[PDB]
Amino acid sequence: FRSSVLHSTHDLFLPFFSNVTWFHARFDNPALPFNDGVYFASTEKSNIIRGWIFGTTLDSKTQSLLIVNNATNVVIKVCEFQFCNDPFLDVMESEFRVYSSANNCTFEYVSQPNLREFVFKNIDGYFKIYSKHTPINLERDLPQGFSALEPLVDLPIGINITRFQTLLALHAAAYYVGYLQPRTFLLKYNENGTITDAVDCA
Amino acid sequence: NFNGLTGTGVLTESNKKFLPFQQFGRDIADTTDAVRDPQTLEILDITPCSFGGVSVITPGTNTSNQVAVLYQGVNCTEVSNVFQTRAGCLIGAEYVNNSYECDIPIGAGICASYQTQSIIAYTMSLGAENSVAYSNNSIAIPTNFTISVTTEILPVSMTKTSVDCTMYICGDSTECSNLLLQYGSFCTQLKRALTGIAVEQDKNTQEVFAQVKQIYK
Amino acid sequence: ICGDSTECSNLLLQYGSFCTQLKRALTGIAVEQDKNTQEVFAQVKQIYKTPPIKYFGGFNFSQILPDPSKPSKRSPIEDLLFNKVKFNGLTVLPPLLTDEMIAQYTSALLAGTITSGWTFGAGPALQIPFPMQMAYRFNGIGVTQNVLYENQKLIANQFNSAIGKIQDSLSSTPSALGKLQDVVNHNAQALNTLVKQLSSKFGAISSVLNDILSRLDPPEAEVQIDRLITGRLQSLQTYVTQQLIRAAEIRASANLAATKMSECVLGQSKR
Amino acid sequence: TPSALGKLQDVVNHNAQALNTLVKQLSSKFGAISSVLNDILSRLDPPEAEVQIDRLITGRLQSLQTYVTQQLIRAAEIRASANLAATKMSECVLGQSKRVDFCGKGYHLMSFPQSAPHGVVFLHVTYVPAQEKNFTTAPAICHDGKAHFPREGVFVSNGTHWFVTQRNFYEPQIITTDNTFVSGNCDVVIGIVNNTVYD
Amino acid sequence: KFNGLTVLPPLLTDEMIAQYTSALLAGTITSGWTFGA
Amino acid sequence: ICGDSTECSNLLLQYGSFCTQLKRALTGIAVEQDKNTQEVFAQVKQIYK
Amino acid sequence: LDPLSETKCTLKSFTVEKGIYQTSNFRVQPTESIVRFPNITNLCPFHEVF
Ligand SMILES: *[C@@H]1O[C@H](CO)[C@@H](O[C@@H]2O[C@H](CO)[C@@H](O[C@@H]3O[C@H](CO)[C@@H](O)[C@H](O)[C@@H]3O)[C@H](O)[C@H]2NC(C)=O)[C@H](O)[C@H]1NC(C)=O
Ligand SMILES: *[C@@H]1O[C@H](CO)[C@@H](O[C@@H]2O[C@H](CO)[C@@H](O)[C@H](O)[C@H]2NC(C)=O)[C@H](O)[C@H]1NC(C)=O
Ligand SMILES: *[C@@H]1O[C@H](CO)[C@@H](O[C@@H]2O[C@H](CO)[C@@H](O)[C@H](O)[C@H]2NC(C)=O)[C@H](O)[C@H]1NC(C)=O
Ligand SMILES: *[C@@H]1O[C@H](CO)[C@@H](O[C@@H]2O[C@H](CO)[C@@H](O)[C@H](O)[C@H]2NC(C)=O)[C@H](O)[C@H]1NC(C)=O
Ligand SMILES: *[C@@H]1O[C@H](CO)[C@@H](O[C@@H]2O[C@H](CO)[C@@H](O)[C@H](O)[C@H]2NC(C)=O)[C@H](O)[C@H]1NC(C)=O
Ligand SMILES: *[C@@H]1O[C@H](CO)[C@@H](O[C@@H]2O[C@H](CO)[C@@H](O)[C@H](O)[C@H]2NC(C)=O)[C@H](O)[C@H]1NC(C)=O
Ligand SMILES: *[C@@H]1O[C@H](CO)[C@@H](O[C@@H]2O[C@H](CO)[C@@H](O)[C@H](O)[C@H]2NC(C)=O)[C@H](O)[C@H]1NC(C)=O
Ligand SMILES: *[C@@H]1O[C@H](CO)[C@@H](O[C@@H]2O[C@H](CO)[C@@H](O)[C@H](O)[C@H]2NC(C)=O)[C@H](O)[C@H]1NC(C)=O
Ligand SMILES: *[C@@H]1O[C@H](CO)[C@@H](O)[C@H](O)[C@H]1NC(C)=O
Ligand SMILES: *[C@@H]1O[C@H](CO)[C@@H](O)[C@H](O)[C@H]1NC(C)=O
Ligand SMILES: *[C@@H]1O[C@H](CO)[C@@H](O)[C@H](O)[C@H]1NC(C)=O
Ligand SMILES: *[C@@H]1O[C@H](CO)[C@@H](O)[C@H](O)[C@H]1NC(C)=O
Ligand SMILES: *[C@@H]1O[C@H](CO)[C@@H](O)[C@H](O)[C@H]1NC(C)=O
DSSP state letters, chain D: -TTTTHHHHHHHHHHHHHHHHHHHGGG--SSSS-S-HHHHHTTS-HHHHHHHHHHHHHHHHHHHHHHHHHHHHHHHHHHHHHHHHHHHHHHHTSS----TTTSSSSEEEEEEEEEETTEEEEEEEEEEEEEEEEEEE-S-EEETTEEEEESSSEEEE-SS-EEEE-SSS---EE-BSSSEEEEEETTS-TT-EE---B-
Helix (H, G, I), strand (E, B) or coil at B165: helix
What does the alpha-carbon distance between residue C80 and residue C146 come to, in Å, rounded to a whole number? 37
End-to-end C-alpha distance for chain B, whole angstroms: 83
- B194 Cα to chain E: minimum distance (Å): 11
Total residue count of chain C as it appears in this document: 271
Chains D and A touch each other (3 or more Cβ pairs < 8 A): no
| Among chain B residues, CA nearest to D139 | B137
Burial zone of D127 (CB within 10 Å; 0-12 exposed, 13-18 middle, 19+ buried): middle
The number of the ligand 6 atom at minimal distance from the alpha carbon of C164 is 5
CA nearest to B110, candidates F26, C95, D130 = C95
Cβ–Cβ of F14/C235 closer than 8 Å? no
What does the alpha-carbon distance between residue D109 and residue B177 come to, in Å, rounded to a whole number? 61
Burial zone of B157 (CB within 10 Å; 0-12 exposed, 13-18 middle, 19+ buried): buried
SS (H, E, C) C73-98: HCCHHHHHHHHHCCCCCCCCCCCCCC
Alpha-carbon separation of residue C261 from B189, C121, C257, D99 (angstroms): 41, 10, 6, 11
SS (H, E, C) B121-138: EEEECCCCEEECCCCCCE
- A68 Cα distance to chain centroid: 12
What does the alpha-carbon distance between residue C145 and residue C151 come to, in Å, rounded to a whole number? 10
* Phi and psi at residue A37, to the nearest 5°: 170, 150
What does the alpha-carbon distance between residue B20 and residue B26 come to, in Å, rounded to a whole number? 16
**Cβ atoms within 10 Å, residue A118:** 19
Q: How does strand A185-189 pair with strand A195-200?
A: antiparallel
CA of G41 to the centre of ligand 1 (A): 14
Q: Is C230 on the interface with D (CB under 8 A)?
A: no
CA nearest to C221, candidates C234, C204, C235 = C204
* Phi and psi at residue E32, to the nearest 5°: 70, -135
Q: Are C33 and C41 in contact (CB under 8 A)?
A: no
| Among chain B residues, CA nearest to C200 | B30
Partners of residue A122 on adjacent β-strands: A127
CA nearest to A1, candidates G37, G36, B30 = B30
Please name the residues in contact with C47: beta carbons below 8 A apart, sequence gap of 6 or more. B126, B127, B128, B129, B130, C104, C105, C107, C108
The number of the ligand 7 atom at minimal distance from the alpha carbon of D160 is 25
Please name the residues in contact with D75: beta carbons below 8 A apart, sequence gap of 6 or more. B158, B197, B200, B201
CA of A90 to the centre of ligand 3 (A): 16
Cβ–Cβ of D28/C123 closer than 8 Å? no
The H-assigned helical ranges of chain C are 8-12, 18-41, 76-84, 99-115, 119-122, 130-140, 145-150, 152-172, 178-196, 209-212, 218-260
Helix (H, G, I), strand (E, B) or coil at B74: coil
Give percent helix, percent strand, percent coil of chain G, each to the nearest 5.
20, 20, 60
Solved using: cryo-EM
Q: Are B111 and G19 in contact (CB under 8 A)?
A: no
Listed by the residue before each break, gaps in chain B with C–N over 2.5 Å are: 79, 116
Nearest CA to ligand 10 atom 5: A192
Please name the residues in contact with B146: beta carbons below 8 A apart, sequence gap of 6 or more. D128, D129, D130
Q: Are A37 and A29 in contact (CB under 8 A)?
A: no
What does the alpha-carbon distance between residue B181 and residue B185 come to, in Å, rounded to a whole number? 8
CA nearest to B75, candidates B85, B63, B64 = B85
Helix (H, G, I), strand (E, B) or coil at A117: strand
Q: How does strand A21-24 pair with strand A163-170?
A: unpaired
Cβ–Cβ of F18/C238 closer than 8 Å? yes
Total residue count of chain G as it appears in this document: 50
Partners of residue D107 on adjacent β-strands: D127
Q: How many CA atoms lie within 13 A of D122 on its CB side?
A: 28
Q: Is residue A108 within a helix (H) or strand (E), and if so which, with residue range?
A: strand A108-109
Of A1, A151, A194, the CB nearest to B24: A1
CA nearest to D135, candidates C148, C122, B143 = B143
CA nearest to C166, candidates C178, C176, C157, C175 = C176
Cβ–Cβ of E35/D26 closer than 8 Å? no
Alpha-carbon separation of residue D12 from B155, B160, D8, D192 (angstroms): 10, 11, 6, 63
Q: Nominal resolution in Å?
A: 3.0
Q: Which amino acid is at E1?
A: K
Partners of residue A177 on adjacent β-strands: A21, A40
Please name the residues in contact with C73: beta carbons below 8 A apart, sequence gap of 6 or more. C66, C67, C100, C103, C104, C107
What does the alpha-carbon distance between residue C261 and residue D102 come to, in Å, rounded to a whole number? 11
Of B152, B158, B176, the CB nearest to D124: B152
What does the alpha-carbon distance between residue C67 and residue D173 come to, in Å, rounded to a whole number? 43
Cβ–Cβ of E12/B166 closer than 8 Å? no
The number of the ligand 6 atom at minimal distance from the alpha carbon of C60 is 1
What does the alpha-carbon distance between residue A153 and residue A109 come to, in Å, rounded to a whole number? 10
**Cβ atoms within 10 Å, residue B125:** 13
Q: Are A49 and A42 in contact (CB under 8 A)?
A: yes
Partners of residue B152 on adjacent β-strands: D122
Total residue count of chain A as it appears in this document: 202
What does the alpha-carbon distance between residue D48 and residue D41 come to, in Å, rounded to a whole number? 9
- B121 Cα distance to chain centroid: 20
Greatest CA span in chain F, whole angstroms? 60
Burial C186-206 (b: 16+ CB within 10 A, else e): eeeebbebbbbbbebbbebbe
CA nearest to C199, candidates C211, C189, C207 = C207
CA nearest to B90, candidates B116, B121, B118 = B121
What does the alpha-carbon distance between residue B102 and residue B113 come to, in Å, rounded to a whole number? 8
Residues of B in contact with A150 (CB under 8 A): 19, 21
- Which of C2, C43, C55, C87 has the most B C-beta neighbours within 10 Å, making it the best mutation to test the interface with B? C87
* C252 conformational bin, left if phi > 0, alpha if psi -120 to 50, beta if neither: alpha
Residue B2 is classified by DSSP as B
What does the alpha-carbon distance between residue C78 and residue C100 come to, in Å, rounded to a whole number? 12
The H-assigned helical ranges of B68-164 are none
Chains G and E touch each other (3 or more Cβ pairs < 8 A): no
How many helices and strands (H and E) does chain A possess? 0, 17
Q: Are A190 and A3 in contact (CB under 8 A)?
A: yes
The number of the ligand 3 atom at minimal distance from the alpha carbon of A72 is 1
Of B1, B51, B56, the CB nearest to G7: B56
DSSP letters, B29-43, are TS-EEEEE-TTT--E
CA nearest to B173, candidates D30, D56, C14, E7 = D56
What does the alpha-carbon distance between residue C44 and residue B127 come to, in Å, rounded to a whole number? 8
Q: Are A14 and A195 in contact (CB under 8 A)?
A: no
Q: Is residue C13 within a helix (H) or strand (E), and if so which, with residue range?
A: none
Helices B174-183 and D46-92 pack at an angle, to 10 degrees, of: 60
Residue A30 is classified by DSSP as -
**Strands, sheet with B104-107, edge to edge from the N-terminal-most edge strand:** B94-95, B118-123, B110-115, B104-107
What does the alpha-carbon distance between residue C213 and residue C5 come to, in Å, rounded to a whole number? 10
Helix (H, G, I), strand (E, B) or coil at G12: coil
Helix (H, G, I), strand (E, B) or coil at C249: helix
CA nearest to C194, candidates B29, D62, D63 = B29
What does the alpha-carbon distance between residue A67 and residue A113 come to, in Å, rounded to a whole number? 9
**Cβ atoms within 10 Å, residue F10:** 10
End-to-end C-alpha distance for chain C, whole angstroms: 51
CA nearest to B148, candidates D100, D122, D125, D4 = D125
